[PDB]
Amino acid sequence: LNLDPVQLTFYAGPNGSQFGFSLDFHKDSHGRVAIVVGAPRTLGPSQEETGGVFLCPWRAEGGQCPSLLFDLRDETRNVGSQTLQTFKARQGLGASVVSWSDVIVACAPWQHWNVLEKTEEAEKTPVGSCFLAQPESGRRAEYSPCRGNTLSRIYVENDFSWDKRYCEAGFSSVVTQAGELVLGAPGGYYFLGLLAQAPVADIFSSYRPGILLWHVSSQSLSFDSSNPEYFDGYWGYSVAVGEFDGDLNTTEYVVGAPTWSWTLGAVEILDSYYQRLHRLRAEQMASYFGHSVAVTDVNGDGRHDLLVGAPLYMESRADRKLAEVGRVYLFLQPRGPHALGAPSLLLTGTQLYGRFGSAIAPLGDLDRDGYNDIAVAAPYGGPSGRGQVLVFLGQSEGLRSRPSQVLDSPFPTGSAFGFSLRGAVDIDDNGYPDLIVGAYGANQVAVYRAQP
């Protein structure tokens, strides 16, 4: 249960690389446990910010980790009459990392792309891109569902239809248990937001080194809309998967659109064919409801529940004033073909500007009492404002309104302690789930162990 805040392990990366911006547990083709760490500002041998990934093996001492190698140089290829070109400068490789059994997946949301044809171009824009790696065999593959070869002028005549030029694919990501990679592209369709997915096996098999624009046959992307409510919504700013329609044969997606309906924010449950199942709207504009989205069964009833962060939520203090503290929302799944009603519980921050709800990670069953628990980040929380992660335990009606444990930041100011979190994995192998906390502002990742 109690995560020891003294014999905690520290891991580190280069200065300014924002090591710990993203992270995940890697259970390799072998069996030990490692920590994939993304550092989106890591310098390339060319001395330009291209980003980078680090694979950290478990060791109570911590420290430096080997770098996970990836192609860091620009590509240019001529196919017929077009010059296809990719730009990796400030692409932010590792702004999003995620391991799925054998393979690791890192993404560069900001990698630019362009196509030239005579005196017309398509534009240089952030289509983003994900790099797939199988550390054992040293193999690599790539997936960039948003690259296109349509010239600028065509979009202007189509009135910007199906414009995936600014996708920022891989901005956020998840892999279902069955091995389907799901990418969140908040810039998709001219800033509406889109989601793209394909089976990791098919991504690897269809990839050909040298081809820059290809179609992964078994892939599918969300849709463009003319409904104003979706305009500038950033649908895909965050994603998650889970079981929500009762049919265990089908998996559903949870997408965050923090700026939906004129900054009102929203979260949606969709099937694998992107057909809508439900929509949780937010309660306050600019609160960023949808920033984070977690899935887990917090009350032991056998059905997945939903957690939504709105880090910018301004709370109603006494005397007609408001205070930005952040807030999380719990939605329990009511059994059968039934709609998720209002919030079953409202956890809300206390420290001003702490951005509570900024990150939500489902721990396993910390205390082993048969009820799953969760951890919520407030990167700028605490009296000092150095950040702090709060642990909330699984009850029977939802969760305890009170934090059972409050982990404070061992790092200086601006560490952004908590911005990324990942739990529910036995790293030390003591039959108990642990918690990793990234602090990109300090370039470090802290490891908290579960002890008896």
Partner: protein, 440 residues
Amino acid sequence: GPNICTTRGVSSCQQCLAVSPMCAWCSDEALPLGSPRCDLKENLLKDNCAPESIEFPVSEARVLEDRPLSDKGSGDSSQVTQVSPQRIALRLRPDDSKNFSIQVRQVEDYPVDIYYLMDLSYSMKDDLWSIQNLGTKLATQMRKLTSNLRIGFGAFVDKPVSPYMYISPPEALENPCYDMKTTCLPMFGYKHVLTLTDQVTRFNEEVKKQSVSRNRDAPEGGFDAIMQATVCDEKIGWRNDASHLLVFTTDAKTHIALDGRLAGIVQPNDGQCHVGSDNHYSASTTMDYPSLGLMTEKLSQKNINLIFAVTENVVNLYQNYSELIPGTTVGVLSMDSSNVLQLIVDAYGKIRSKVELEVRDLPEELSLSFNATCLNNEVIPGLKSCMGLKIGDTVSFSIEAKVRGCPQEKEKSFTIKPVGFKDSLIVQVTFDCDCACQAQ
């Protein structure tokens, strides 16, 4: 009968006055050479004293100059009078105390500062006339409400970073409109063009020389501009003693905090000034947009009233943001300026000033006390400050001067004037110690 003036009577007329304000004298020989020479006035009358040789000074303090408080300012404000009795001569005997009056009226116009924030993005093209007219009509409306104004303005578009900014072809960096076969200025976050000044005609010429730029996404970085125009004291030129109005314009949505991640920007807004020599917001490409909360905090911290002049297609949206930031009004920007101008009128009518008296240069051997009477006419002793008064309102104070003995300074003067005013009450103090040459 035996009284304190007699119990200590010694030998001089002067010494008799130095005993107490109530003591008198009598240099009349017609009195028995053993009777009370120093005593009360009534006691000296019963002792048969000639009312000619009696020396019984009294404190008076006369009003020298005192032209009434005026009732206007339009035409020519030469030197107007908003204080009562500008000069009084206070003459008092040892240890005595004389009380006088003074009253002020707020006659001068309230100092007002307006800073215009122009959305100069491409979607503003068809609105450019409207915001120029408004900016011009702004300086007019205020100038009619207050002869004391300092107007200025700045412009914004968005963060000069992909994907907001067009970064291809190479000509697009200098001319974003290049792709459309037309031409516009290069993109910029926020630019401070005209510091607050009283030169209205120069403000109007400058505002009309403004043209649009281009950006890719509808939402803009107006909030980056509101933040900067708020926290850059010296740059903007806000004058601390005055009312601060910040009019903001736009015809579209806006970027709120956490949007910057699409530009690779994650550092939360530090809420500090970043407009250097070049008059540009330098953090534009490295710092995120500010959140509603940070804005509110800063707006209050600097006492700035935010006003939204926005197009009708986005009015509801700004009304909703208006509720999340208290004390902010919203007007609908268009060719017709009636609406947004009302908000400027209202803001003025809500201004309140205060009369707080201060005492400069008063002898150490002299002390004052005040009895204030504010709006509600409720007299409260000790207090010398009134609040909540509009233009024209009048407030009065009762002052009492007290001395300790008889100073060798025989001629002095001090001033009592309210802060934020120029009109003062000068008091000439004269200490009457010596007698009319009485000898015995």
